[PDB]
Subunit: 178 residues, 2 copies
């Protein structure tokens, strides 16, 4: 993430907010703890909504942005990170088993989006996809984050499609200007 | 009754203490006497990712919010009986029989209760604040997701907002015109 890049990304976020009806975030990876740090955001206008602050951190194993990044790493890499960092249980849905988490990451790669299903906070869902540089390194993720009351089970795939398309547009934007 | 920044400053700790105890966003709204609306004039947000975050200057509908119905409950049955009510949700009380019965109950329990009548997944509990002439001018509400404001919590939350509104009433009486 750059600055004239940040400037192109921003209207992509605004349009995604409008299209999804939910708050949208972009985050970069903390290489120390593998938390995702929120560096930009466009909130929706719903009274009830996701409103984490800029510079706020989303958990490695338990957020959309966290798991989107984690999904890009190898089996061993993730085995080592889990061995180090542990799997704090935020909620009763948090994936605190390595086999369960690893399965979820495999599925994340297969479908093109991560899905936080009240793993970070009760009532909270997020869908996220990474943004890639010329080395296929994930250098950013976009997430759509909102209440289970609106991000309903029948909408998850549709929401996943929307975040895929958004993350794609930024990857292409970076490709074009770099 | 008249709220100034100075008075908001004086009562702020009560709102902050209420956000802390309830873990939810606390709002203070005033009744516009000309246009019969409830206008948010202060707020202490909770730190949850997912929370209620209406803007300052935001309006909460009369028939369909905690603050609104807390104001309506202060009126005589004739005053309420005396034009089409918007349905925000399937739960919005648009039938005058139903509305009046809810206001009846509000007066008996000491607090209003918006149960997804304004927005799906949003609950609020509120009670009025009174000036030196015992006239209702403001209301304090606790507002948050049905995920956290669960059925086992509604009465307890009601009690918290009665006690808070009373403390605002007391503080106002002593600091009137500040």
């Amino acid at each position: 993430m750059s600055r004239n890049l940040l400037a192109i990304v921003h209207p992509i976020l605004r349009n995604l907010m409008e299209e999804s009806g939910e708050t949208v975030n972009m985050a970069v990876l903390d290489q120390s703890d593998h938390e995702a740090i929120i560096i930009d955001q466009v909130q929706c206008t719903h009274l009830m909504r996701m409103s984490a602050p800029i510079g706020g951190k989303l958990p490695m194993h338990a957020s959309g942005a966290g798991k989107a990044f984690l999904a890009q790493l190898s089996e061993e890499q993730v085995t080592k990170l889990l061995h180090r960092k542990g799997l704090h249980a935020y909620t009763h849905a948090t994936l605190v088993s390595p086999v369960h988490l690893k399965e979820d990451l495999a599925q994340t790669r297969k479908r093109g989006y991560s899905f936080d299903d009240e793993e970070h906070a009760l009532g909270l869902r997020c869908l996220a996809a990474c943004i890639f540089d010329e080395h296929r390194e994930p250098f950013a993720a976009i997430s759509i984050s909102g209440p289970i009351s609106r991000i309903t089970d029948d909408r998850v795939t549709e929401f996943g499609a929307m975040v895929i398309k958004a993350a794609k547009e930024v990857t292409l934007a970076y490709g074009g200007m770099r």
